[PDB]
Design a protein around this nucleic acid. Structure first.
Ligand SMILES: C[C@H]1O[C@H](O[C@H]2[C@H](O)[C@@H](O)[C@@H](O)[C@H](O)[C@@H]2O)[C@@H](N)C[C@@H]1NC(=N)C(=O)O
Ligand SMILES: [K+]
Ligand SMILES: [K+]
Ligand SMILES: [K+]
Ligand SMILES: [K+]
Ligand SMILES: [K+]
Ligand SMILES: [K+]
Ligand SMILES: [K+]
Ligand SMILES: [K+]
Ligand SMILES: [K+]
Ligand SMILES: [Mg+2]
Ligand SMILES: [Mg+2]
Ligand SMILES: [Mg+2]
Ligand SMILES: [Mg+2]
Ligand SMILES: [Mg+2]
Ligand SMILES: [Mg+2]
Ligand SMILES: [Mg+2]
Ligand SMILES: [Mg+2]
Ligand SMILES: [Mg+2]
Ligand SMILES: [Mg+2]
Ligand SMILES: [Mg+2]
Ligand SMILES: [Mg+2]
Ligand SMILES: [Mg+2]
Ligand SMILES: [Mg+2]
Ligand SMILES: [Mg+2]
Ligand SMILES: [Mg+2]
Ligand SMILES: [Mg+2]
Ligand SMILES: [Mg+2]
Ligand SMILES: [Mg+2]
Ligand SMILES: [Mg+2]
Ligand SMILES: [Mg+2]
Ligand SMILES: [Mg+2]
Ligand SMILES: [Mg+2]
Ligand SMILES: [Mg+2]
Lengths: 129, 78, 70, 205, 121, 155
RNA sequence: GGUAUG
RNA sequence: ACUGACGCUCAGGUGCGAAAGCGUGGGGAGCAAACAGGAUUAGAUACCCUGGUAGUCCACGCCGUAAACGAUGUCGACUUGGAGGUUGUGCCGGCGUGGCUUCCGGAGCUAACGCGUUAAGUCGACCGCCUGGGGAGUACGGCCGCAAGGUUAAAACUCAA
RNA sequence: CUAACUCCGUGCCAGCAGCCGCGGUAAUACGGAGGGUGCAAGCGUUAAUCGGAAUUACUGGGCGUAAAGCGCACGCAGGCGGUUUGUUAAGUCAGAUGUGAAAUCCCCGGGCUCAACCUGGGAACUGCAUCUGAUACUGGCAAGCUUGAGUCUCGUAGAGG
């Protein structure tokens, strides 16, 4: 059964990019939307929208640059089978700073850079080189 | 002040209950968070608890071979 | 610089696996002998019954190298 | 504990003057510097990458007259010190009293220097120091002792140093027969023929 | 292996056997020669290699190679054995130490003397 | 261009007669400033094999976006059964690498790098893994460009 | 119809 | 239309499980281990021929194994196509839309062969299993079995594959 | 491999050997010699541990054919769990306090002529406990929701038993 919706979201992005799809779409959730925002604001996706009310659908718009896909890598880190939390001082650097770790802190989901500046640890959702 | 909360798993002793405390701890090697359980023999003066209740307990002087904890309060009933 | 070998004459009694032979010497001791390298490479076949020269060692008088077949 | 063998063999093996003779006479006039020592010297074989690393290491050792255990410790120190391991290594070797006494021109060869130091003819900041390995620090004053200023070999050695390029990081009064280790040398101040990265690679294997 | 499986059953080390069990983690052992013979090697090689069967102080009984040209060992000689297989002799895991106890040094040897128990000329 | 011979191997086909031996040469060439190519040449004799490899290497050179004689970030390369890991190092580290990786990194002009080859260490595959890894290495500039950011916002 | 072995 | 996360996986457990085989009792055309004879051959404990018993069939009970194979664990999601088959269904022979299934092939994956929306691709959950060859699926012990045996399962040693 | 080659003796013998291998007449591989390489008051050998070994793979591996998917199912414990709101604050995160002996390691110094050694101060001791906060995520509790999973209605095909 479906036991990791975030991993599903990341896989839709990874797979959508490899298929050169313009948009991908999925069942929405607060957290998926939270992650989409971080992706948008770091410029790994162009845009996103939640349409619908009873069964909301998240729709990410994917970015390409000189034909190639902008999201080179996107791996789930913390997962249901094995959760990963890091303190402020031991937050991961993805691609020596050139990528993001998306972190869930007590002040909401943000990049590892943002969590370092706030002085917050939290759950490592994913890497996005 | 220093208390543990946990769940009664036996009441078949006079004035005594077994209480299972549940801890969630990161595995030293593999990093997975594992549920682990401590079972304490507890002192229950008035036999007020029964199996399934959630109880607050505090450490105290020895009271028997196996009891060094005493019931503070019953938090939830079965 | 090597120590000297006793060359003794003898008769092959049985052929054993992998060019090993029982050989009764003149003195009457039955050594387990093996074919020389030179003979192996030059395809000199040894048989039951054959007359053979056996190089021996003082270190072990149960063993020898067949060096010549008559 | 020291190499007491023929000096020019070492040069001939490395294929370079390691400055193991005074320099009163050119090295080609004393030995076939092109040709490696021994009966099979003439046939120049291709070295492996290990061989290249090795002969680099051995060049530096033989220059400075340091055996392998002491040399390896220099490497370990140079690696511990902050900055560039290879650079540090050459700085340490340059620090050695025997080297300094040579680079000041009190000894003809680094071995003569070593004998001066060993025989209690050298003072650092007024005190006698008979240890070739002694690390001279910035602003130290290396000097000949009163007793050994009347040694003909010291006079001769100073003449020979004038012929060589004078080190900048040292400053010698030839008349007083004393000198000042002003600073540690920079990599640039030492000879560029030494490829210290090979040595660091060698010790990382 | 999933995490959960490793939590339940952790990764196990390969339990590494010694190649020299008779030594019982000693650098050498003393023994008495019960037999001193020769043996032919495995396929490609050809020789009569000098060996001895030796009973050690710890009761183990082993075969030990006798290296060098020529030896003085008999039955009942007291020798020191050390580790070291001989590739072409099945079941020979030990070498005899030349120039220790009853085993003599090799005569007239001038190179690798220390390996064959021979004093400097 | 620097030029390095990594490996020479004698191969053979069988024929009615007996065996026809021939030679293979694996080489890398690079400018010492983040251009590097490899070539693999075959011939009946080694020098011709090497020459063919050098010719092929010269025409098949990639660009690698270096950063002051080291890598931009950690990289993983894979080819066939050869997995290679390379990370940036400090000045004076040197090339800490094994063999086929070293050649590629030398001639590309990587002065300081830590590297490790896992899996198969067949030179022909390790070289491909290494160069693969280098060719997919992102600089700060091209990351900023793809993400629609400036280099300062990235860094 | 079994093509034992140069 | 209804319930409202009631789900997925599953050590141990429980059951089902080709054929041969075993027990008791039926049945017995054809076929056929064993066996008898006839040949073939250097021999021919075979292949070939003539026969032929157990067995093959039934009932009940046991056994629990097979190249029990897709040599591919179960569940869920995602990711270009082409040609078929089969079974529903909607709409006007055509145009859709579901289920199962055969073949080819793209990206990708793979040591390669190949796999390729029924993945061996991209991911997530849980379980089972591997760690050089031989020794050995053997020994010992336990459990199961009327037995045949099955299951769990080593080591010494030897080889440099 | 691995820095360093010749002659003579021997002739798959004697012997070498960590592995690959060498030795059967012109052996850079055995023994001696000359020459050379490496170490040096040591040098070799053996033993033993970690490394290289991503060869037990948490970091960091595999299972179609290389070793590896239970013959197949159901299913208890266990592991994992769609979506919204509230609440809780167990996990998690933050700050602080206590503690984490000294020695050792590391850093910056100081002393023995130097070094080893000795030594001042620091850092570290990745931990544990407590208190005070944060509340995104996970867990708990409460209430929901319908997209997972089911039930009902009508019908269809099928060597399912
Ligand atoms: C016909 C024979 O075929 C097979 O033996 C063959 C032998 O007869 C020769 O032709 C060669 O050695 C082949 O290489 C062998 O395979 C072997 N199966 C035995 C057979 N012979 C008989 N069964 C018989 O002669 O009778
Ligand atoms: K350093
Ligand atoms: K041989
Ligand atoms: K269960
Ligand atoms: K019958
Ligand atoms: K191919
Ligand atoms: K084995
Ligand atoms: K048994
Ligand atoms: K793993
Ligand atoms: K919560
Ligand atoms: Mg008590
Ligand atoms: Mg010393
Ligand atoms: Mg049957
Ligand atoms: Mg029956
Ligand atoms: Mg019949
Ligand atoms: Mg018949
Ligand atoms: Mg089976
Ligand atoms: Mg089938
Ligand atoms: Mg199977
Ligand atoms: Mg199931
Ligand atoms: Mg296909
Ligand atoms: Mg595969
Ligand atoms: Mg069995
Ligand atoms: Mg060499
Ligand atoms: Mg000769
Ligand atoms: Mg390991
Ligand atoms: Mg493997
Ligand atoms: Mg097979
Ligand atoms: Mg298999
Ligand atoms: Mg199966
Ligand atoms: Mg949830
Ligand atoms: Mg808390
Ligand atoms: Mg302490
Ligand atoms: Mg909650």
């Amino acid at each position: 059964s479906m036991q990791d919706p975030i991993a599903d979201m990341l896989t839709r992005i990874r797979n959508g990019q490899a298929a050169n799809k313009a948009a991908v779409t999925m069942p929405s959730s607060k957290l998926k939307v939270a992650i989409a925002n971080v992706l948008k604001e770091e410029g790994f996706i162009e845009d996103f929208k939640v349409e619908g009310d009873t069964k909301p659908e998240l729709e990410l718009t994917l970015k390409y640059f000189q034909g190639k896909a902008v999201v080179e890598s996107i791996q789930r880190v913390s997962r249901p089978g094995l959760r990963i939390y890091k303190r402020k001082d031991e937050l991961p650097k993805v691609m020596a700073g050139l990528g993001i770790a998306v972190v869930s802190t007590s002040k909401g989901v943000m990049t590892d850079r943002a969590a370092r500046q706030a002085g917050l640890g939290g759950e490592i959702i994913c890497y996005v080189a | 002040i220093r208390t543990l909360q946990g769940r009664v798993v036996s009441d078949k002793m006079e004035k005594s209950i077994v209480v299972a405390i549940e801890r969630f701890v990161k595995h030293p090697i593999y990093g997975k968070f594992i549920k682990r359980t401590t079972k304490l023999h507890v002192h229950d003066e008035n036999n007020e608890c029964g199996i399934g209740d959630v109880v607050e307990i505090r450490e105290c002087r020895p009271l028997s071979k196996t009891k060094s904890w005493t019931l503070v309060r019953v938090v939830e009933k079965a | 610089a090597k120590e000297d070998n006793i060359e003794m004459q003898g008769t092959v009694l049985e052929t054993l696996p992998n060019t090993m032979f029982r050989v009764e010497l003149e003195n009457g001791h039955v050594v387990t002998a093996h074919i020389s390298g030179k003979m192996r490479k030059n395809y000199i076949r040894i048989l039951t019954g054959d007359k053979v020269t056996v190089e021996l060692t003082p270190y072990d008088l149960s063993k020898g190298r067949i060096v010549f077949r008559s | 504990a020291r190499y007491l063998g023929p000096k020019l063999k070492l040069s001939r093996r490395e294929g370079t003057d390691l400055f193991l003779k005074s320099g009163v006479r050119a090295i080609d006039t004393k030995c076939k510097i092109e040709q490696a020592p021994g009966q099979h010297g003439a046939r120049k074989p291709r070295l492996s990458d290990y061989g290249v690393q090795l002969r680099e290491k051995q060049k530096v050792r033989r220059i400075y007259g340091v055996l392998e255990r002491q040399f390896r410790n220099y490497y370990k120190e140079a690696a511990r010190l902050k900055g560039n391991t290879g650079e540090n290594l050459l700085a340490l070797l340059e620090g050695r009293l025997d080297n300094v006494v040579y680079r000041m021109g009190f000894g003809a060869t680094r071995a003569e220097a070593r004998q001066l130091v060993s025989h209690k003819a050298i003072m650092v900041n007024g005190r006698v120091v008979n240890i070739a390995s002694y690390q001279v620090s910035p602003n130290d004053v290396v000097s000949i002792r009163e007793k050994a200023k009347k040694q003909s070999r010291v006079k001769a050695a100073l003449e020979l140093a004038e012929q060589r390029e004078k080190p900048t990081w040292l400053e010698v009064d030839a008349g007083k027969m004393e000198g000042t280790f002003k600073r540690k040398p920079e990599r640039s101040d030492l000879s560029a023929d030494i490829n210290e990265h090979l040595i660091v690679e060698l010790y990382s294997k | 292996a999933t995490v959960n499986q490793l939590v339940r059953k952790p990764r196990a080390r390969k339990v590494a056997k010694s190649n020299v069990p008779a030594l019982e983690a000693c650098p050498q052992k003393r023994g008495v020669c019960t037999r001193v013979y020769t043996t032919t090697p495995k396929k490609p090689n050809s020789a009569l290699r000098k060996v001895c069967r030796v009973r050690l102080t710890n009761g183990f009984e082993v075969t030990s190679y006798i290296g060098g040209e020529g030896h003085n060992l008999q039955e009942h000689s007291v020798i020191l054995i050390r580790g070291g297989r001989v590739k072409d002799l099945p079941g020979v895991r030990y070498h005899t130490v030349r120039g220790a106890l009853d085993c003599s040094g090799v005569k007239d040897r001038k190179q690798a003397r220390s390996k064959y128990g021979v004093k400097r000329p | 261009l620097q030029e390095k011979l990594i490996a020479v191997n004698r191969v053979s086909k069988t024929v009615k007669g007996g065996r026809i031996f021939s030679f293979t040469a694996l080489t890398v060439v690079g400018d010492g400033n983040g251009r590097v190519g490899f070539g693999y040449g075959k011939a009946r004799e080694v020098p011709a094999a090497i020459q063919k490899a050098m010719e092929k290497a010269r025409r098949n050179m990639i660009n690698v976006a270096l950063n002051n004689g080291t890598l931009q970030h950690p990289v993983k390369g894979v080819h066939t059964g050869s997995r290679v890991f390379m990370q940036p190092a400090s000045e004076g580290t040197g090339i800490i690498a094994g063999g086929a990786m070293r050649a590629v990194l030398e001639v590309a002009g990587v002065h300081n790098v830590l590297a490790k080859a896992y899996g198969s260490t067949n030179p022909i595959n390790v070289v491909r893994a290494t160069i693969d890894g280098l060719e997919n290495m992102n600089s700060p500039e091209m990351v900023a460009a793809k993400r629609g950011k400036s280099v300062e916002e990235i860094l």
